[PDB]
């Protein structure tokens with residue numbers, strides 16, 4: 300039910316492999332137009348907001 | 360030094376101006392299929408003076424974003440590399456597409472391609488040898504190459520090949536090509552002299568690489584049972600024949616080469632690549648999907664070699680499809696597509712060092 304998702308917040312208290320998978324999933328979800336992505340500058344937080352295509356199972 | 364970052368503007372799928380990086384000592388480029396990872400490989404080649412023929416297009420203007428559908432977004436495009444060195448100001452090497460021609464710049468000052476390539480050569484970047492770039496689907500062929508093509512590489516890196524033309528001329532002048540070569544006095548001595556110069560140039564490179572490759576193939580496979588041997592087919596005139604390359608895979612018995620697995624061929628090829636580096640070090644390697652045939656054991660060993668080498672010796676920029684490999688990088692550059700008339704590529708950056716590589 301959120302307006303936006305912070306990648307860094309999702310990855311708090313995860314290990315490297317889990318964090319990398321969450322990052323990769325953002326790339327896939329953006330390719331699928333399920334989300335829009337913003338990153339202010341290199342290595343800042345990556346923020347997702349709803350994209351122009353519906354997506355199921357987004358709570359995962 | 361090291362590649363600090365790449366800046367790209369309207370090059371192939373990289374629409375608009377984008378900063379790529381900054382790179383860490385070990386950075387992995389990742390992303391879903393067709394998002395534009397290879398196009399980034401080509402941008403690096405491009406700014407390092409690569410020929411248009413090798414950049415998957417037919418003419419220079421086709422590298423401008425939107426050309427493949429007749430919608431070029433600009434009459435110009437560029438790729439720029441910021442090269443960094445401790446104790447030194449940043450140096451920017453840029454190649455700009457203007458009109459239908461390339462313009463070369465160092466710190467925004469126009470230079471001819473000759474001076475550009477000469478400056479990069481002084482950093483360890485050999486545009487011709489290209490010993491720092493391993494393209495997609497090509498790591499194995501480095502270990503299965505023909506012996507004579509391996510010699511051509513050593514002639515290029517060692518500069519002994521610059522002597523080949525004069526060598527052939529003097530060889531024929533002293534009697535080569537006659538039924539009974541009668542080599543007497545002055546013409547024979549002139550050939551022996553160029554022969555020795557060519558020998559000396561070649562061996563200054565080959566000896567260093569041949570005597571360093573065994574430890575690297577060990578440290579790569581991390582087993583004492585592994586061995587690597589580089590030997591000339593013609594010891595008296597190594598530049599005349601092929602360079603043989605044979606390995607004993609770790610923990611196994613000797614098997615020729617071409618018999619090995621894709622994975623074992625990969626490690627042998629990387630061994631050769633890093634042994635060349637020990638003689639004439641390049642600042643960075645760009646490795647496109649070199650982990651494709653590696654199992655998980657060899658992925659760890661290659662990644663660990665890079666990490667224990669990315670602090671001191673060199674920087675590694677890899678493109679990988681395998682989380683087993685790219686989760687060992689310090690940071691990730693993720694490539695993703697934006698919807699449009701043609702494929703639009705953009706990137707994210709993610710620092711993996713914030714997270715424990717454990718449980």
Ligand SMILES: Nc1ncnc2c1ncn2[C@@H]1O[C@H](COP(=O)(O)OP(=O)(O)OP(O)(O)=S)[C@@H](O)[C@H]1O
Nearest residue numbers: 371372392393394395396397398422423424425701
């Ligand atoms: N000048 C250009 N303008 C727009 N798109 C281009 C241009 N040049 C190449 N492309 C596109 O780049 C896309 C593929 O580029 P790549 O870098 O090879 O992607 P990729 O992620 O490496 O795909 P793989 O390796 O097959 S999974 C193609 O769809 C091209 O149409």
Ligand SMILES: [Mg+2]
Nearest residue numbers: 396397398495
């Ligand atoms: Mg690719």
